[PDB]
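User: I'm putting together a teaching handout on how sequence relates to shape, and I'd like one worked example. Could you take thaumatin I from Thaumatococcus daniellii, show the sequence you're using, and then write out its predicted structure as tokens right after it?

Assistant: Happy to. First the sequence, then the structure tokens directly below it.
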Amino acid sequence: ATFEIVNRCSYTVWAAASKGDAALDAGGRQLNSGESWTINVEPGTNGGKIWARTDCYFDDSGSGICKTGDCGGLLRCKRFGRPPTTLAEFSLNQYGKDYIDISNIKGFNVPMDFSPTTRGCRGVRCAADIVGQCPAKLKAPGGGCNDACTVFQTSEYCCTTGKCGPTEYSRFFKRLCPDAFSYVLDKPTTVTCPGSSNYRVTFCPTA
């Protein structure tokens, strides 16, 4: 499958793509404002994620730091990033179908649209000003709006027992972005697409 990753933000982001134990394609790249990066993701990939990182500094060896979404200090991510990260999530060619969603379960840093570029399903978007409206206790100094599990580490926020409900914090994310997951047991906002669809992930789709 082809993913085109587009930075429509007015600021530079460092895109990342991983399935948790390996990079997808090159795993990461700098995207200046307006730049597009096309990657190829192998059919059958389960549990892939794409996200943006902000305020990064990398040396010549591809080693450094980012203020949101850092993946162990690497430009080319092999593992998932540090919250807060708005997440594009996908599993491809699962019994004939692709499944895509946007998630705020690990917080929010950059607004995002995640849409197919082929026929057969709709896209999803979270483009509200979650950072500007972020509750005081969830604000991340480096930028972004943390999820409550990251901040407070309780069974209820992290849904550790497999029994949890919505919370004041999850309802904040859900109010602003109804089409994204706001906590682990949220009513699913997953979209089912034809197997082997292609996609575009756009950072700052409105701005």
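A couple of points you could highlight for students: The radius of gyration is 16 Å. The first helix runs from residue 130 to 133.
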